[PDB]
Design a protein around this ligand. Structure first.
Ligand code: HEM
Ligand SMILES: NC(=[NH2+])NCCC[C@H](N)C(=O)O
Length: 244
């Protein structure tokens, strides 16, 4: 019924040539990435959330869009939002989009990601937040669903130098509600300490440095969309080029 899974429920996602028959493998690669010991995954928060049982999963199967597509993901997002606002603050939803496409370029995976986020809006039950501009060209735009803005980023196997955003063979969407950042807002002492620690991790793991669009946390950053789909290099997209 529900396509929202905890780690122990993933194996029932699918088998074989079924819808989601590739999902257990995608899940297994993801957990190996973020639990690796040497070098450790740069985001220790994410590692800790996995070890502690606080990550949830879902998927989109491009071969079954009527049943295992954007409409179903929108249901899973609503169920996740409810779980994310209870119990531990540091929860993440990880969504695999598959099956994997051997040979896909990063730009192909980014286009897929934006099309998904665009499409999901049609299946929201709630009014768009009246304090968040709905127009993606606005500097204060953020992707919103079920009444609130989310934190969201795209992971792909086509990230070569920014290996931290290679989470396995599928386009992967990593969703969180703002609750995750309680106590470690970018302007707090703890929040700065967390940036230093993750950034040291990145230097160890990736071949390219942290991207310029990740700010210092002292103000709300304009054109947050850019952080959703970082390039594999140091280039900065035109602020008006959000594909939604
Ligand atoms: C499975 C879950 C997670 C993954 C895969 C993950 C992944 C990442 C990655 C790849 C970055 C580097 C910046 C970027 O590419 O956008 C990052 C940075 C960060 N993450 Fe995580 N994360 C996870 C969960 C969390 C959670 C649950 C929190 C908070 C509780 C958190 C806090 C942060 C912080 C503070 C940074 C540093 C941002 C900066 O230096 O500006 N992450 N995360
Ligand atoms: N797990 C992550 N990559 N988090 C990115 C945080 C984005 C940032 N706090 C902002 O809204 O400007």
């Amino acid at each position: 019924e529900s396509y929202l899974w905890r780690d122990s429920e993933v194996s029932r996602s699918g088998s074989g040539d079924e819808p989601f028959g590739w999902v257990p493998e995608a899940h297994s690669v993801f957990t190996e990435r973020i639990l690796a010991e040497e070098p450790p995954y740069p985001c220790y928060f994410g590692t800790q959330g996995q070890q502690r049982g606080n990550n949830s999963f879902s998927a989109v199967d491009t071969r079954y869009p009527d049943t295992h597509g954007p409409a179903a993901l929108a249901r899973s997002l609503r169920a996740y939002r409810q779980r994310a606002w209870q119990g531990p603050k540091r929860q993440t939803l990880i969504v695999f989009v598959g099956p994997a496409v051997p040979g896909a370029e990063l730009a192909d995976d980014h286009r897929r990601f934006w099309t998904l986020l665009d499409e999901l809006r049609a299946y929201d039950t709630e009014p768009w937040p009246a304090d968040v501009p709905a127009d993606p060209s606005d500097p204060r735009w953020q992707w919103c669903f079920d009444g609130e803005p989310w934190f969201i980023f795209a992971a792909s196997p086509a990230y070569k130098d920014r290996r931290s955003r290679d989470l396995g063979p599928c386009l992967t969407l990593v969703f969180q509600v703002r609750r995750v950042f309680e106590g470690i807002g970018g302007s707090t002492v703890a929040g700065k300490a967390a940036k230093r620690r993750v950034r040291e991790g990145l230097a160890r793991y990736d071949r390219i440095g942290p991207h310029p669009t990740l700010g210092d946390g002292d103000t709300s950053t304009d054109f947050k969309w850019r952080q959703y789909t970082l390039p594999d290099d140091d280039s900065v997209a035109a602020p008006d080029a959000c594909p939604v």
